[PDB]
Amino acid sequence: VQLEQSGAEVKKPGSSVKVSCKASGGTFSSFVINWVRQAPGQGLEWVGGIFQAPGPEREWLRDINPISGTINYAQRFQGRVTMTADESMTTVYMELSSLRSEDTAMYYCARENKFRYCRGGSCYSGAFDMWGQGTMVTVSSASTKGPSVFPLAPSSKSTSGGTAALGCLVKDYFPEPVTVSWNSGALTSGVHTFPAVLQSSGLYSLSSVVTVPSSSLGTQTYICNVNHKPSNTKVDKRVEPK
Amino acid sequence: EIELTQSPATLSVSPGESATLSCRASQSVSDNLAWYQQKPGQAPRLLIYGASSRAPAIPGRFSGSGSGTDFTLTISRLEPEDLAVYHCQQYGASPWTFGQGTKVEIKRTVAAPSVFIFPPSDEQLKSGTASVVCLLNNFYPREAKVQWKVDNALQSGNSQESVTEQDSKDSTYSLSSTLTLSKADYEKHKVYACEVTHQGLSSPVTKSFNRGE
Amino acid sequence: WHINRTALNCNDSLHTGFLAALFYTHKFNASGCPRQCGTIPASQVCGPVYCFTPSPVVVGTTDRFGAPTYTWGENETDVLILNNTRPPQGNWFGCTWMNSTGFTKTCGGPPCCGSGPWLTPRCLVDYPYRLWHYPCTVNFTIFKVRMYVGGVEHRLNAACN
Numbered sequence: 365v366q367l368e369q370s371g372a373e374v375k376k377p378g379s380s381v382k383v384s385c386k387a388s389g390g391t392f393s394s395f396v397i398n399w400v401r402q403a404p405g406q407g408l409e410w411v412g413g414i415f416q417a418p419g420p421e422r423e424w425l426r427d428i429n430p431i432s433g434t435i436n437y438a439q440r441f442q443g444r445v446t447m448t449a450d451e452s453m454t455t456v457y458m459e460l461s462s463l464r465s466e467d468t469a470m471y472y473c474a475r476e477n478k479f480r481y482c483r484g485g486s487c488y489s490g491a492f493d494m495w496g497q498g499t500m501v502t503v504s505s506a507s508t509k510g511p512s513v514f515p516l517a518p519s520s521k522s523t524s525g526g527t528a529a530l531g532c533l534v535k536d537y538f539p540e541p542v543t544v545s546w547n548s549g550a551l552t553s554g555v556h557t558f559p560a561v562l563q564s565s566g567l568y569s570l571s572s573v574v575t576v577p578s579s580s581l582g583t584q585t586y587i588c589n590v591n592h593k594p595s596n597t598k599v600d601k602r603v604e605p606k
Numbered sequence: 607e608i609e610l611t612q613s614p615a616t617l618s619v620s621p622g623e624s625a626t627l628s629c630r631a632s633q634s635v636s637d638n639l640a641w642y643q644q645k646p647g648q649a650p651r652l653l654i655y656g657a658s659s660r661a662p663a664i665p666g667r668f669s670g671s672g673s674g675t676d677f678t679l680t681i682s683r684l685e686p687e688d689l690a691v692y693h694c695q696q697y698g699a700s701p702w703t704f705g706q707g708t709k710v711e712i713k714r715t716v717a718a719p720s721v722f723i724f725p726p727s728d729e730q731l732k733s734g735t736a737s738v739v740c741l742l743n744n745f746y747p748r749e750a751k752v753q754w755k756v757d758n759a760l761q762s763g764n765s766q767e768s769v770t771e772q773d774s775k776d777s778t779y780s781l782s783s784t785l786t787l788s789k790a791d792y793e794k795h796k797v798y799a800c801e802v803t804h805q806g807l808s809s810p811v812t813k814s815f816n817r818g819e
Numbered sequence: 820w821h822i823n824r825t826a827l828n829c830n831d832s833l834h835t836g837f838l839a840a841l842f843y844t845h846k847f848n849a850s851g852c853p854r855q856c857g858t859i860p861a862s863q864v865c866g867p868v869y870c871f872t873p874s875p876v877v878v879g880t881t882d883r884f885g886a887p888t889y890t891w892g893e894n895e896t897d898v899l900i901l902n903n904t905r906p907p908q909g910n911w912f913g914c915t916w917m918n919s920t921g922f923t924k925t926c927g928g929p930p931c932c933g934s935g936p937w938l939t940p941r942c943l944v945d946y947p948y949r950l951w952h953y954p955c956t957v958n959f960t961i962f963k964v965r966m967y968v969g970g971v972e973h974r975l976n977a978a979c980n
């Protein structure tokens with residue numbers, strides 16, 4: 365019914381990672397479970413696929429059976445990716461070894477039905493019709509570190525007409541993600557929490573800004589709630605005028 | 607392997623108009639071609655399999671056509687929800703390969719950015735570093751140029767910027783640029799300015815402050 | 820007889836996996852679990868077609884006048900003429916097959932009540948595709964049985980509950 369993948373992973377270069385894809389509402393039986401990866405900005409890349417045989421082949425139909433081997437890997441990953449399934453066929457794993465920084469990517473599992481339809485002596489696929497939510501895999505030499513949170517104080521230099529901008533700078537953390545809310549989720553409108561940027565230091569940095577009526581400065585209290593779960597770091601920063 | 611070229615790289619379409627995406631394969635892949643929709647921060651979703659056969663629950667405005675090498679995805683009446691990256695994939699010959707994706711953003715009227723500048727905090731200065739943030743708020747289109755000047759010296763290679771995804775109601779973008787200096791360098795200098803160039807501005811806008819004033 | 824005489828107009832739109840179970844022998848778990856025999860168009864048929872004179876026999880595609888065709892039933896004029904495997908004497912004849920979207924179809928059957936391969940409410944004729952057409956009979960027990968119709972002796976295997 366639905367594909368649920370394991371949680372985000374952070375790995376040092378040269379290491380290995382093992383990501384799981386679990387079926388809810390049934391079994392992977394008779395499907396190919398594929399793995400597709402997507403480097404942070406880039407397009408999709410097939411890693412390989414593993415077929416979950418419902419049972420022994422009926423060999424009088426061997427010549428038109430569309431399955432060519434239970435396990436297929438893209439050439440780029442041969443020798444360092446292993447795909448397995450448990451005997452229940454409710455979980456398929458992808459283990460990727462000798463990790464490199466270019467292996468940093470979101471890893472999706474996706475179900476493929478190679479027996480979508482048949483006609484005239486051959487059967488055709490339904491493509492990748494059901495996708496897991498993705499498992500982010502970060503490959504970096506950096507060590508886990510909670511952010512420093514600094515105010516982005518409103519000023520005359522951050523007002524236009526009757527509206528002011530203020531924010532929080534969330535600097536020097538590893539790894540992704542952080543969450544930022546404002547006033548414990550009470551203000552969401554007008555908030556821009558920018559995509560983190562990876563600094564040359566290997567640590568990430570992010571700002572979160574919000575626009576508010578200028579007549580609220582020094583009357584309304586503004587707190588950014590920063591949560592960096594990988595380092596167990598939570599910070600509430602009051603942001604007030606210059 | 608089979609090479610899939612998607613064109614154009616970016617599409618800007620006004621709501622209610624049609625979007626035509628192209629996907630061209632090196633060798634022939636014979637209707638074994640699929641289209642996926644990837645909305646911001648989400649997993650890819652299947653729209654079309656077998657070049658023209660349409661996945662269930664996919665609205666009728668999505669149509670794929672073609673065979674062999676030249677394929678097209680047509681989005682007839684565009685809704686703002688259709689903001690996404692569209693990927694084509696061939697499964698005619700292993701290994702399966704994907705195009706590089708076509709981003710479809712929502713066309714809207716041009717809007718100049720509101721430009722805000724933030725000096726480093728005193729809390730950060732005592733840590734040894736100064737980050738100066740220039741904020742470009744709610745502009746369209748996404749192309750924008752930020753340039754930093756410190757006492758009129760052009761800064762290059764010591765700033766980084768981030769752009770938000772297009773806003774779902776506004777159809778607008780925002781941009782943050784952070785200039786990073788040491789505390790010592792920060793205090794050797796007076797005028798900090800970011801200069802913003804954008805199609806909605808008659809000429810570049812500069813927002814600046816004088817340190818300690 | 821030829822592989823190509825199997826009608827192969829198969830369509831698993833809902834991704835149930837029934838079409839995969841044509842190519843592999845798929846056993847079920849507990850959770851998952853008249854009319855006369857004329858001429859059916861191959862377009863409505865997926866996988867092999869069995870008829871039962873008690874004894875099981877396969878029907879291959881032909882044209883409308885009974886000459887064998889070898890186009891996997893893709894031809895609009897391709898049919899399975901079930902009645903041409905009806906033995907000239909004996910009052911027992913049923914058939915079973917899968918329609919295009921994975922629903923088991925039956926044209927009775929035992930003289931009576933039962934339908935197709937079924938001999939009693941308890942028992943049906945065993946044949947190579949029983950578990951595909953009747954997956955919920957996976958843990959039926961297999962008995963060697965013997966039946967007489969029209970004087971002729973039929974030796975077959977029956978699956979019984």
Ligand SMILES: *[C@@H]1O[C@H](CO)[C@@H](O[C@@H]2O[C@H](CO)[C@@H](O[C@@H]3O[C@H](CO[C@H]4O[C@H](CO[C@H]5O[C@H](CO)[C@@H](O)[C@H](O)[C@@H]5O)[C@@H](O)[C@H](O[C@H]5O[C@H](CO)[C@@H](O)[C@H](O)[C@@H]5O)[C@@H]4O)[C@@H](O)[C@H](O[C@H]4O[C@H](CO)[C@@H](O)[C@H](O)[C@@H]4O)[C@@H]3O)[C@H](O)[C@H]2NC(C)=O)[C@H](O)[C@H]1NC(C)=O
Pocket residue numbers: 882883884890894895896
């Ligand atoms: C989809 O299915 C259709 C079938 O419905 C199929 O069409 C057949 O195609 C094959 C191959 O191209 C044709 O085969 C040729 O047959 C030639 C003889 O044709 C005459 O005889 C046929 C059989 O007649 C017997 O059976 C009928 C029915 O019981 C009976 O009435 C007769 O008296 C006789 O007993 C007959 O069906 C056919 O009828 C068609 O044509 C007549 C006259 O044109 C027309 O009036 C009809 O209305 C009907 O359209 C005709 O009377 C045969 O000579 C020929 O052999 C040549 O080639 C081979 C190989 O090169 C050589 O060895 C040989 O020496 C000859 O050079 C060949 O075997 C067959 O006739 C078609 N059937 C029909 C009904 O058209 C399609 O191909 C299928 N399509 C796909 C996608 O696969």
Ligand SMILES: *[C@@H]1O[C@H](CO)[C@@H](O[C@@H]2O[C@H](CO)[C@@H](O)[C@H](O[C@@H]3O[C@H](CO[C@H]4O[C@H](CO)[C@@H](O)[C@H](O)[C@@H]4O)[C@@H](O)[C@H](O)[C@@H]3O)[C@H]2NC(C)=O)[C@H](O)[C@H]1NC(C)=O
Pocket residue numbers: 863918919920921922
């Ligand atoms: C393969 O074989 C299966 C099994 O027979 C075929 O599926 C059947 O196809 C026939 C012909 O189309 C349909 O009549 C059967 O489904 C339907 O019956 C419906 C009755 O449902 C009730 O509830 C609806 C709710 O919307 C009410 O509106 C109705 O009034 C009914 O009270 C009817 O609604 C549908 O319109 C339809 O007639 C259908 N049965 C099953 C199990 O699906 C299948 O089509 C065959 N496949 C092929 C391609 O040959």
Ligand SMILES: *[C@@H]1O[C@H](CO)[C@@H](O[C@@H]2O[C@H](CO)[C@@H](O[C@@H]3O[C@H](CO[C@H]4O[C@H](CO)[C@@H](O)[C@H](O)[C@@H]4O)[C@@H](O)[C@H](O)[C@@H]3O)[C@H](O)[C@H]2NC(C)=O)[C@H](O)[C@H]1NC(C)=O
Pocket residue numbers: 484485823889890
């Ligand atoms: C039973 O069903 C099978 C599957 O449908 C049938 O196989 C089909 O047979 C037809 C015969 O007309 C083929 O159609 C032609 O295929 C040729 C292929 O030629 C290539 O290979 C040869 C041999 O090495 C080589 O010399 C050539 O240079 C080619 O590279 C094409 O050239 C023709 O254009 C035409 O497409 C089908 O391709 C074939 N399909 C499959 C999947 O095998 C078989 O004919 C049926 N048997 C009977 C008795 O009817």
Ligand SMILES: *[C@@H]1O[C@H](CO)[C@@H](O[C@@H]2O[C@H](CO)[C@@H](O)[C@H](O)[C@H]2NC(C)=O)[C@H](O)[C@H]1NC(C)=O
Pocket residue numbers: 481830831832920
């Ligand atoms: C498989 O079965 C499905 C459902 O029976 C068919 O779906 C139909 O597709 C056509 C053309 O795309 C539509 O015009 C119909 O409205 C669809 N029916 C519905 C209501 O789902 C499908 O064509 C069949 N064939 C294949 C090869 O998938």
Ligand SMILES: *[C@@H]1O[C@H](CO)[C@@H](O)[C@H](O)[C@H]1NC(C)=O
Pocket residue numbers: 847848849850852955957958
């Ligand atoms: C049939 O018996 C088997 C084998 O012991 C059991 O595993 C299976 O679940 C049963 N199937 C059903 C329909 O319960």
